[PDB]
Symmetry: C3
Subunit: 255 residues, 3 copies
């Protein structure tokens, strides 16, 4: 049996690496580029201009590279390497001219029926659990986990190693390591489980626990908090990752 | 390349207008009528008795015209966009509760339109919005992502629900609702300005909101107080009529 | 015509009863077993080791028998008789080694886009309404009704004849007959409506109303409540079902 199933439709403008697998009844549309070792399942719709990197797995009933719901404006979707895109996932392209294309990095897991809205940016090692929805212009940093049915408002930033509880509705920025829950989302604590899994030192975990309290439990303003964290951020690069996510928040921080 | 892809299944009783496009591996079932300029994507399941109007677009993995889990019908108007994975059930004809969708609607990815529901014109049902059944959505309503609507609920003209809202009661026209359970917050003044409502009409609607929600009046007292402004501004009469026709009470 | 559509793919290791119907563009994977009177719709993906019983109906765009997006461990899915699996439903296999296969009994209705996580167990006469998600290791007892978009945390037990309202987020065990609402889920009352439809005696309904008060409205600890329910449970099999569900609660009960 051929690597490209004879029941699949490959557009003559699509560029594929030699070992790409494409399952039956799948469409690889115009201007779709697919890298080495990628596996396209059956019943998949791929639309371009889209770049899919190496060693990716895209499951049935997914629509990857769709137009968002002027004529001829260049729009693009870039997906890196070692990603898993499960059944029914929808991923929209993003505008090129303004450097706001839809981008997905490496080693991500995008679970069933998740939605990635136009101009969203997903880093590396993220997990978007079933039916997570990024409205659009969402920035998800490395190792973030969004539990099932997490809804993210347009323009929100989800910090590195952050966590959302199931059914959370995020309206403001989530700082690095922070855990959020409910509709509307509220900050609860820090992802100490994720910190341990990543092999963080005891001094680094303690400095981060102290950092959370400075921001959320000591009644200080964002301006007051950032000034107090300066000393701790200089000694630990992980407290600096927390400090930078607060400093770069536009919609305010999830409290 | 033919308009009707040779890999699609078209039942002999289906009636398609000459320029209708059907993508590969789509099923156009028996008693399905499709009007001029409509585009059916690939992997679409269309079941009848269903009448689809002119210049519609139906995306992949949609199931339109499903039986509810006696002649039943589904009627879809003109210029609608039905995105990927949307599910639309038919409604009962004898009791005049067929499922109806008007014109210029945008029904986004994985939205669900339960049996006997009625959607007006220019409505937006964002991703995963779910109408349980017998839901009436009036013109220009916006239901944000993952809005859930209890059976028999009425969604007023130009109303708005925030993301993840769970609506159990009627939403009056223009009203903005948020959360689970849904709570009224304000009016959609932004929408009024886009529609070209006058400053005077907006002013009267803002006063009408206060009468219903911020002055401790009963529904009976509020309706009597709005009578004067409703005769003067047709937009206020839209707001008053939606409260008058509320069978499950109003969202507060 | 032909019971198996010529456009369907039937793996040579699949075992089917002679009258099994399979629609166009459906995949019946390796190690899939399908019983008498079952109808598989078009665009269905079935993956094994999976057993599907008699007189079942599986709708378009469903992925039944897939492996979880995180694990040579042999895993299985077993589905009983007279079930209806609506469009876009995802059902994952379990694990055999620790006796946690994913199992679904008889006369169940699994509505559009519902998710059945790995190692979950569904009894009989249950209804999972549109987009209900069982994260994994979830036990759903007989006649439970989970309203649209109900989210169920891993390891939660849903009691017999219980009911969740639309958009409920369940993080603790739901006792038998209990009605729960919101995110986080909160106990409200009992499903008396369901009892009456099931033909429960007025005496059994009266005893269950009293049982709810003992657990939830009289300031008793779970130890105290279980001691007070002992007498009623010995007399009413329906009260024993309620008592057993509180006894077997590992995550505490939904209050
Ligand atoms: C299974 C399981 N393992 N951990 C959890 C908790 N979790 C976060 C999480 C989930 C998966 C990975 C992984 N790889 C990591 C973290 C949730 O999102 C629960 S909700 C949910 C879960 C699954 C489907 C639908 C829903 Cl709604 O679930
Ligand atoms: C994109 C975008 N543009 N506006 C918004 C806000 N919006 C209303 C809205 C959304 C789209 C149109 C349109 N055509 C109009 C209004 C939401 O529904 C947010 S939630 C959400 C949003 C998108 C996907 C999934 C989810 Cl869950 O999102
Ligand atoms: C229709 C209808 N008939 N009863 C209800 C109430 N119901 C429970 C329920 C639903 C169906 C059966 C059945 N067979 C039994 C109980 C809900 O879940 C409402 S929410 C919902 C409902 C439908 C789609 C999306 C959503 Cl979100 O809806």
């Amino acid at each position: 049996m051929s690597l490209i199933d004879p029941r699949a439709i490959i557009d003559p403008s699509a560029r594929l690496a030699a070992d790409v697998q494409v399952g039956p009844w799948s469409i690889v549309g115009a201007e779709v580029e697919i890298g080495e070792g990628t596996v396209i399942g059956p019943h998949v719709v791929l639309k371009g201009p889209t770049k899919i990197g190496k060693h990716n797995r895209i499951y049935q009933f997914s629509s990857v590279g769709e137009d968002t719901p002027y004529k001829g404006e260049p729009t693009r979707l870039v997906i890196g390497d070692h990603n898993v895109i499960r059944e029914g996932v929808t991923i929209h392209r993003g505008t090129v001219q303004d450097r706001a294309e839809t981008t997905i990095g490496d080693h991500n897991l995008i679970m069933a029926y998740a939605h990635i809205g136009h101009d969203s940016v997903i880093g590396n090692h993220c997990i978007l659990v079933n039916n997570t929805a990024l409205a659009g212009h969402v920035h998800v940093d490395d190792w973030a986990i969004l539990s099932g049915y997490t809804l993210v408002h347009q323009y929100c930033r989800i910090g590195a190693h952050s966590f959302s509880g199931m059914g959370s509705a995020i309206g403001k920025d989530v700082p690095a390591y922070v855990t959020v829950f409910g509709n509307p989302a509220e900050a609860r604590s820090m992802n100490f489980e994720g910190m341990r899994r990543r092999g963080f030192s005891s001094e680094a975990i303690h400095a981060l626990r102290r950092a959370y309290k400075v921001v959320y439990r000591q009644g200080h303003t964002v301006e007051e908090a950032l000034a107090e964290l300066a000393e701790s951020a200089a000694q630990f690069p992980e407290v600096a990752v927390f400090r930078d996510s607060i400093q770069s928040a536009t919609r305010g921080i999830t409290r």
